[PDB]
Each structure stands twice: as C-alpha cells, then as structure tokens.
Design a protein around this ligand. Structure first.
Ligand code: MG
Ligand code: ZN
Lengths: 52, 468, 225, 104, 136
RNA sequence: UCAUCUAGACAGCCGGACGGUGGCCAUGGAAGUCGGAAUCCGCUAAGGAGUGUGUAACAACUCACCGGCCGAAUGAACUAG
RNA sequence: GGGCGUGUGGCGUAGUCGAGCGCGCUCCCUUAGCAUGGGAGAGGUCUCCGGUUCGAUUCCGGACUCGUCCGCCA
C-alpha cells in the first residue's frame, strides 16, 4: 500500500493515459488524435488497461 | 505502508500474555502486531526493521535484529525513536522470536530487550509485566549458551543485585505462571510450528524443548516463592493435570534425557512441597507415567539412558515412602516393570546406580516389595559377576566396584543366613583374585578398604605363597 | 547450533573452512554472511584467520587441524606460512608435510585425542602427525572409503560417518575411536559429510540445504545443546 | 448485517497479506476460543476464488454453509443466488414445452 | 563450465577438442569418456569446441558398464596433459587426459578419484575437491 | 446541408436541475437509469415518465435544460484541392 | 513441409438429435471316444475438450491422431 492520495497522484502520470491502437503511443487521456506522424495522427485510441 | 485491521482479535478480547492492550502469544497465527500500530512507529527505519523481522527467512531476521541492536546502542541519538508504540510492537514480535529454531535469533532478541530495559529504565514499567516473564524463560532454557549470557545480562541490568533478581521472581510470579500455562495447555505442537515447513518430528522436538523450559521455570518459581502453591492453586492444577508435561517422560525416543530429568525434578519438588500428596489425581498420573518409563529403557538404548537411571530410582524410593508403597499399588504390573527395569539396568552400571538401588531396597524392605533371597540376591550376584568380567575396562570402575561393595555389604547384613554370607566371601575373593589391577589402583584399593576380618586375609596371602 | 551458511552459493562449508576448538580458518574470497556467521557464533575468544593454502580457496580439504597443531601441504608458500604463524596463537604448531597425497583434510580425519588416516600414507607422515598433533593414529577405511576426512565428521563428543556404512564397521570404528558414531547425511542428502560441515565442541556450521532431521542428528551426535 | 461483519473480518486479514494457510489456522484457533465470527466461518476457505463459506442458522437451528464473494456486498451475493433460481425457472418452462413433443 | 561454477577461471590452453577420449578417473565403473561438447564454448566457422582443465563437458561412455553406455552425461576435466601456463608462469602438464562424471549442478556421480587433479579444477568444483585424493 | 447568434451563441468556472409519480405491465427486488410498451401535465427562467455513474431496491453524484461572469461567432455531419 | 480423411467395451466392429452385436473370458451345466454344445456374465469416460441441443456418436469448433496423397537440382 502506498496511500490512497499518493496512489492517485502516481496513477495520474502512470495509468490515466490513452494508447494509440496503431503505434502504441502513450497519449493524454482526453486526446482525440495521436501526436505521432508514423500513424498519420489517427483517431483510433483506447484507454490504457488498468489492473483489478 | 501497512494495511489491514485485526478485526478477529477485537472480537476475541483476549490479551494472552500481554497486559498492555496487545495480545502476545507464542503461536505464529495470532498476536502479530496490528498494522495501524506499525504505521504509527516513529521512523521509517524502525518500520523497515519490523518488516524484515516478520519475514520467514532467518538471514533477513538476523540482519534486522542486528540493525535494531545498532539503533539501541546509539541510545542518545535514538531515544526519540523508541516509544511506547515500539515497545508494544516489540513485545508481540519478541514472543515469537524467543521460540525460534535459530539460536542467534534467540540470543539477539534477549540481548535487545535487556538493553531496552537498561536504557529506558522507569519508562518500561508499563511493559515490564509483558517483558519480564519472557526474559526469564530465556534464562531458564536448557541450552547453556542462550541461558548463561541472558542471566548475566539481566543481573548486570539490575546492577548486580541478587535481591532484585529474586524479587522479580516474586513480583511477577502470577504472570510467570500464566506463561507456563500457555505453553503447556493452550499450545500444541502444531500451533508452535508451521506444518508445511516442518515434519511430524521436529515439530514435536520443538514443542518439547519449549515445554521443558517452562517446567524448569516452574521449578525455579516454586523454589523462589514459598507461598506460590497456596495463592495460585487453581492455575497450578490446570497446568499439572494436562498430560503434556507428563508426555515428556518418554525414553523410547528423543535426543536427550535432559528434558526427562527436568520432569523428574518437578515431581520430586512437588512431593517435597506436598502438592502431589495433597492432590491425588496429579500424583497418580505422574506415577503411572514414571512406571511406564521404566519399561521404555531397553538394551538398545541402555547406553543413552544410563545417566538418568540413578535419578529415576531415587525418585521412586522417595515416592514409595509416601502411602506405604502406595505408588506400587497404583499399577498392577508395577512390580513386573521394576523387575524388568532392574534386569536391563544391571547390565550397564553408571556412577551412583548402586546407591539408588540400595535406597529403593531400604524403602521396600519394611513392606517386603522384593523377596530378599529368591529375588534380590540373584540380582546382586549377577551384578558382581558382570562387574568383574568387564571392570577395569571403564574408568569409573574403581568407584563403581567400591560402591557395589559398600552397598552389597549393607544388604548382606540384613540376612542372618549362611548362603548370603557364603556368597559374600566367595564373590569378594573372586572379585579381588581375577581382578585386574585392584591393588595397583591405590584409590580403588583405598575405596574398597576391606571386606572381611584382617587376620583371615593374611591367611589367604599365606596360601598364595604356599601354592604350587 | 548447526548454523546455516553458504560460501557464495556453496553448501559445503568443510571445504572452505577448518574449525577447531582453539582457532578457525576461513577462505579469503568469502561473503559477508559467511564471515559474519563465524564472527557472531565464535565470538572474540577464538581467532578467525582469513587464509589461503597453496594458492587455493579450498583450505579445509588441504589442511588437517588440531588444538595442539596444524598441518599444511608442501605447496603452501612462505608468505602464507608466516601469516598463519603471526595470526595463530603461540600454542599451536604449524609444520609443512612432504607427502604425496598432499590434501591433508581429505586424507586425515582427526580430533583432539584420536585420528583416522588414509591407509596408504607414509610412515614419516604418520610419525609427524603423532608428534605435532600429539594424537594416536589408526589406518582405517570407512566401509571402503579411503578418504576418511571427506567421509567422516569427527569431534570429541561424537562422530558422523558415511550413510552407506556397514553396521559392523560402525561398532568397530566406535570402539576404535572411543566415541559414538551415527550414519547420516548432510546438505539435503549429500554423502560427503566431512566436506559438508565443520564441527567442534560447541559449534557446528553446515550448508543451508541441510534439512531439519539432519540438523537434529548433528546436534544429537555432537551434543551441542 | 452479521454477514457484512464476517466479510470485513476476512478482508482485514487479506489486506495484511498474511499467508492464506496461516489465516485458516487462525480461524481454527478463534473457534476454540469461541469467537462468534470464527464459529460462523467454515474452516476451508476458497481464498483463491475469493469465496468464503459461512454457516447461517435456518431459524434464528441447523447452520447451512453459504458461499459469499468477498468483493460483492452481502446483499449482492444473495441476489446472485436469486438469479440462479430465476434462470432455473426459465429453463424449466422451456423444458415443459419440450417434453410433450420429445416423448412423442 | 557455466552454471555450477564456483567463481571464475583464468584461460587455460585448450587441449581436448570434440572427439577426444579421456580416461575416467572416478569409481563409477566407466573406463573412458568421449567428449561431444564443451559448455560455454563460442562459435566460429570450422573451429572445434575444445576443452581445458576444470571445464564441464558433455560426454558419452564409449567403454565401460552398459547402463552408463549409449547416453550423454556431463563430465568435468581433471587432468589435461597439454601444457598450460599459470600466472606464476610455471608450465605444467599431466601425462594423461582424465575426467569424472557429474550432474549439471556439478556433484560427482562417483565417490573417489584416482590420481592427481589440478588446483584450477579443485578450486572451481568443490565436490571434485572433496572426493579428490591429491590436488596439485 | 442542417442548426444556435449582441433579446448574449460555443469553451471555462458557479448555482438550480423540481412536483403529480414509487406514471402502467413485469420481478424476490427494480422508485429516470434489468426489460416491454406508452411518454402526459403542473410550476416554470428551466428541468427527460431520463444522459451516465450508481444501490438488493433505495439513497447519492452527474448530465441536457435554464440562469450570473465572458461579449461574438460557434457546433454537428459530409464533399474535394 | 503441406493437403485430406480417421477414431465405439479387454479386442473387433453397427450406428437417424433418442450406444448394439460378435470375440477373448466370468461362472454354471454338458459328453463311450478322435469334446464340445447350451444357459445366464462383466465390459464403453463413443480419441479428448468446449459450444449448441432438449440431451448430443449422432450438431458444430479446437486439439490429438493414425492413415493417405503431393512436393528439389544439374
Ligand atoms: Mg566447415
Ligand atoms: Zn499513433
């Protein structure tokens, strides 16, 4: 156990992201398009897979 | 950092050994420190030491103990670190640690607690009731290495005052008894040691070592406190009634007779106190078990069990006196067991064995336990013959033979019969004549000062010169 | 105690260490836990010497030790011999042995009073053992095992021998050594008991994989309680 | 209400990260001590599946072991049992229609 | 060597390539060992994997007892007979190639070793040093 | 091509987001939110017989709607260089 | 290598979405031989595992699998 607030603060940077389906890039959670050129700024995004 | 609540313990409302609001118990499953208390510890370093102590591997535990000791050594810097919360947690862990298989863990834990008492004197008063019984149990542990240092440290802690050490026995006697009860009655071999990591044996071995320490403590408590029997009778009865103390009286299996010896001492002490006479059931249970032990001694284990045999016989003689040999009456086959025991015992003689045998005879003669002529003499004669064939072989030989003669001579005196007199003379001559080098060992000759009138011995010397 | 120790992963402590009543010898290339076991258990009363014998980390199989004397092979250098002479107390005698078998811990199984040797040792080496160690010597094999030092662990109180040993050989060796002997295993069933562990009057050190019945057999036969 | 307390008690031990075997030994010890919660719990626990079996008196007499998921609320666990009943009833109704034709 | 190594080993001049037959020094009933592989050997085109003293090899019993023949087992080289240099600069060699049988962890299948063994092997394998008569 | 727009639009904060009514069937329960149908009034500046989270069912939170600040364009879908 | 088919009792072998026979032998009875017959026996995870079904050899998917067939150059 870390602490509940400290787990929230660490998960803000480590777990509450989104993943581009084409190029696996770690993206902002409210993003609409990937920031990478190689996937062509696609809008195929998924949430980052949580535990539990 | 630490999570979870001991909800079950709250329902239980039993503090076990602890009187400070924390359950303290020897068994692994319960009495573990509460997580909230662990969070409350003053420093991160303390928390880490505790986590390591909880972990099963010994090397990790030893390192943690070493770290804790280092922190205590620098007390002035770390006085802030040690707080009631630390003491409550330590008390719960210390109990588990003292039962540890590894000696180093046991020794270090004892040293650490003593240091805490010296350094935090007068602030550990609340916790003295929890700590003192455990410290004492360590000082009364069969292994010399754990016990001697621990006692020396304790004496030093109390400024080398004998009175203080004795006072401790008196002040916490009720608590000391509670610890004994917990080991003897509350615990079982399984509870003390995890089954997965231990065999059926070993688990038994461990329990027995711990229980032996409890008995040694009980004997010490009785000696130190004269009025213990009256004040704590109910508690004493429950500890005594349980068969666990008595199960220790088995010589068929087991590494040492030291534990068995401790039980014998307890029975003797109880008889001297009169508790055994006072409570018949406890006495009968003890006596029957002792008789069973006599059967256990066998030719295969005679060498191993030989030191304990003089002691066993001596206790029996004392018990026989009670109730006019009432002890033999309890068991229908007791006489047979004794006869068998004697036959096995005679083959291997240990120092002091003969004196015990005579003592038994002295108690038994008034009530005619053994026929003097049909039964006893054969035992004596065979014994001398055996002694002669393989006498010098051993060292104690001179002492052992001396003993036989002194004892046999007394036995012979109460005969008023020709056969006994004849046997004495013939055996004496044989013992001296085949001999070995009886004259040469001056001590042996001195110890065996004489067996007959002076002039006759001279006549026999005369025959040897006169012989072909 | 039979103390659980490893030599960097090795569960054979008799190979890398030699323990007597008066001194202890440990290899120079050892871990902190391995040194800390001997330092904590032995205490400050008994010197512990970090030594190398003949340029080798193995010292227990190279040397045969006693409270009165220490025997070293011919290949031991003058620097190692002088370091042992300075570090050891004045009571013990250190003498080089000039003998073909040259691995004295494997060759010789010895205690304070009586010793068992390899049958084929030279007579000068036997007299050298009897002189320096002050110990009476028998040439005997343990059920056909010529390496009595590797296949027996011996102390004053008792002895542990090879597990596959004839019972007649057990009472013969027990009567010859005047100590009780038990056939048993060490380090989760390893046959080499003398290489497996070291023992003296009050301490035994064994590998971590030595199981609890084996450790109980050790403390029972060596009377360490 | 009693069931919820039982669930909380088991959970606290799990949170500590205590060995599952040790936890069970503890339950047994508590039963000897007469802890009420301890008495309710059956000795074998399917911790791997997070299921605890708790004996419940038929009438506030005989106690029937009931599987409870630690994660779900006590009420929720009960609904799952109710759901099984509902599914069984639906199956039975379909079977009734099937039987007449099947027999022919 | 590899897994069961107790420490490292300085480079000894390689004397036993693949296909070499060495004497079987222990009392396991095997007479010779035939080397088919060397543990830890590198890869080069046309180069035979060669063994030195103290190395662990894979070997078959070509001559010996039938329950030891016709299978592969690990072995440890204890006598080399090709001269090699130590860091004190003596060039030394035995008069025959010899090895013992072991498991992959390194403990000996046999119980006693006949003849000398090298100290570079005895330091690296403790069971070999345990059952070894003379270490040079 | 649809919509909104100085009579205050879209983002961002803040407040309300209600009664008839736990609308009718159906379920051991399901009260806006397991489903089937209907989907209407009042008070309104405004609030769906409910957008989700949500409980055994509740309770609770949030929505799309209206309001203060902002003062001017903005939202959705689609087409092709 | 690939493709394709296959699989039932201790053995063999018949099977509609509703596991049978024969044999080895379990027992009992039988007979002028150059010795048999009769009557009751046991025995399946239908290769295996899922889904479907109302249940599945029987329906379907996966795996196993044994048998088949086809595959280089100068
Ligand atoms: Mg090539
Ligand atoms: Zn992308």
């Amino acid at each position: 156990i870390i602490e509940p607030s400290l787990k929230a603060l660490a998960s803000k940077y480590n777990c509450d992201k989104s993943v581009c389906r084409k190029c696996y890039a770690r993206l902002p959670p409210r993003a609409t398009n990937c920031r990478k050129r190689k996937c062509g700024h696609t809008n195929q995004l998924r949430p980052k897979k949580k535990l539990k | 950092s630490f999570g979870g609540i001991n909800t079950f313990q709250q329902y239980n409302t039993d503090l076990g050994l602890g009187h400070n609001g924390v359950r303290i118990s020897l068994n692994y499953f319960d009495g573990l420190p509460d997580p909230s208390l662990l969070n409350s510890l003053y420093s991160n370093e303390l928390k880490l030491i505790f986590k390591s102590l909880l972990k099963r591997d010994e090397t990790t535990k030893e390192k943690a103990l070493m770290d804790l000791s280092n922190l205590i050594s620098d007390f002035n810097q770390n006085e802030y670190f040690f707080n009631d919360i630390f003491l409550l947690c330590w008390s719960q862990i210390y109990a588990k640690l003292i039962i540890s298989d590894y000696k180093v863990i046991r020794l270090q834990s004892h040293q650490i607690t003593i240091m805490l008492v010296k350094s935090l004197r007068k602030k550990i008063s609340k916790f003295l009731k929890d700590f003192i019984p455990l410290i004492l149990l360590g000082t009364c542990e069969l292994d010399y290495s754990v016990s001697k240092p621990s006692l020396n440290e304790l004496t030093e802690c109390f400024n080398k005052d004998p009175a203080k050490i004795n006072a401790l026995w008196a002040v916490f006697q009720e608590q000391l008894l509670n610890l004994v009860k917990e080991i003897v009655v509350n615990e079982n071999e399984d509870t003390i040691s995890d089954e997965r990591y231990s065999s059926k044996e070993e688990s038994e071995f461990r329990y027995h070592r711990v229980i032996a320490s409890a008995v040694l403590l009980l004997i010490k408590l009785f000696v130190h406190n004269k009025d213990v029997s009256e004040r704590n009778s109910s508690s004493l009865k429950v500890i005594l009634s349980d068969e666990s103390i008595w199960k220790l009286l088995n010589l068929k299996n087991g590494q040492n007779t030291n534990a068995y010896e401790t039980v014998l001492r307890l029975i003797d002490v109880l008889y001297t106190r009169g508790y055994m006479p006072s409570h018949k059931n406890i006495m009968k249970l003890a006596v029957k078990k002792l008789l069973k032990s006599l059967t256990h001694i066998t030719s295969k284990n005679i060498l191993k069990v030989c030191p304990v045999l003089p002691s066993i016989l001596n206790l029996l003689a004392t018990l026989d006196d009670y109730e006019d040999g009432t002890i033999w009456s309890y068991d229908k086959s007791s006489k047979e067991k004794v006869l068998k025991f004697l036959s096995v015992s005679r083959t291997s003689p240990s120092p002091g064995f003969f004196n015990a045998v005579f003592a038994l005879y002295s108690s038994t003669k008034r009530h005619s336990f053994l026929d003097y002529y049909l039964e006893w003499l054969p035992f004596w004669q065979k014994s001398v013959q055996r002694l002669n064939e393989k006498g010098f072989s051993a060292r104690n030989s001179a002492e052992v033979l001396n003993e036989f003669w002194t004892n046999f001579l007394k036995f012979a005196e109460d005969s008023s019969e020709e056969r006994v007199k004849k046997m004495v003379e013939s055996e004496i001559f044989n013992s001296l004549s085949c001999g070995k080098s009886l004259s040469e060992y001056t001590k042996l000759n001195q110890t065996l000062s004489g067996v007959f009138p002076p002039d006759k011995w001279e006549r026999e010397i005369e025959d040897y010169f006169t012989s072909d | 105690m039979a103390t659980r120790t490893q030599f960097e992963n090795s569960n054979e402590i008799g190979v890398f260490s030699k323990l007597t009543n008066t001194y202890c010898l440990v290899a120079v290339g050892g871990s902190e836990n391995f040194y800390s076991a001997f330092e904590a258990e032995l205490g400050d009363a008994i010197p512990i010497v970090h030594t190398t014998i003949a340029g080798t980390r193995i010292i227990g199989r190279m040397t045969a030790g006693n409270r009165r004397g220490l025997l070293v092979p011919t290949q031991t250098t003058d620097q190692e011999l002088q370091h042992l002479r300075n570090s050891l107390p004045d009571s013990v005698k250190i003498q080089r042995v000039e003998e073909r078998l040259s691995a004295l811990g494997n060759v010789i199984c010895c205690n304070d009073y009586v010793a068992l040797v390899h049958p084929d040792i030279d007579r000068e080496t036997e007299e050298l053992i009897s002189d320096v160690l002050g110990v009476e010597v028998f040439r005997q094999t343990i059920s056909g095992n010529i390496l009595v030092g590797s296949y027996c662990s011996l102390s004053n109180q008792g002895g542990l021998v090879h597990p596959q040993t004839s019972v007649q050989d057990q009472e013969e060796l027990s009567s010859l050594l005047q100590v009780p002997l038990v056939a048993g295993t060490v380090n989760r069933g390893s046959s080499v008991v003398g290489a497996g562990m070291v023992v003296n009057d009050y301490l035994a050190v064994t590998g971590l994989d030595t199981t609890a019945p084996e450790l109980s057999v050790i403390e029972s036969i060596f009377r360490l309680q | 209400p009693l069931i919820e307390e039982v669930k909380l008690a088991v959970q606290g031990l799990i949170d500590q990260q205590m060995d599952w075997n040790t936890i069970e030994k503890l339950i047994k010890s508590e039963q000897k001590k007469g802890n009420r919660i301890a008495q309710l719990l059956n000795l074998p626990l399917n911790l791997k599946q997070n299921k605890i079996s708790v004996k419940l008196d038929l009438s506030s007499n005989e106690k029937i072991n009931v599987t409870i998921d630690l994660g779900l609320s006590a009420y929720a666990n009960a609904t799952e049992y109710f759901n099984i009943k509902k599914t069984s009833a639906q199956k039975q109704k379909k079977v009734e229609k099937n039987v007449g034709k099947a027999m022919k | 060597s590899g897994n069961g190594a107790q420490g490292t080993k300085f480079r000894i001049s390689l004397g036993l390539p693949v296909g070499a037959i060495m004497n079987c020094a222990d009392n396991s009933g095997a007479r010779n060992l035939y080397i088919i592989a060397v543990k830890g050997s590198g890869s080069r085109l046309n180069r035979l994997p060669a063994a030195s003293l103290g190395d662990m090899v894979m070997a078959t019993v070509k001559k010996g007892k039938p329950e030891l023949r016709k299978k592969v087992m690990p072995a440890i080289v204890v006598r080399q007979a090709k001269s090699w240099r130590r860091r004190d600069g003596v060039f030394l060699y035995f008069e025959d190639n010899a090895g013992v049988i072991a498991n992959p962890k390194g403990e000996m299948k046999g119980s006693a070793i006949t003849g000398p063994v090298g100290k570079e092997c005895a330091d690296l394998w403790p069971r070999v040093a345990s059952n070894s008569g003379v270490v040079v």
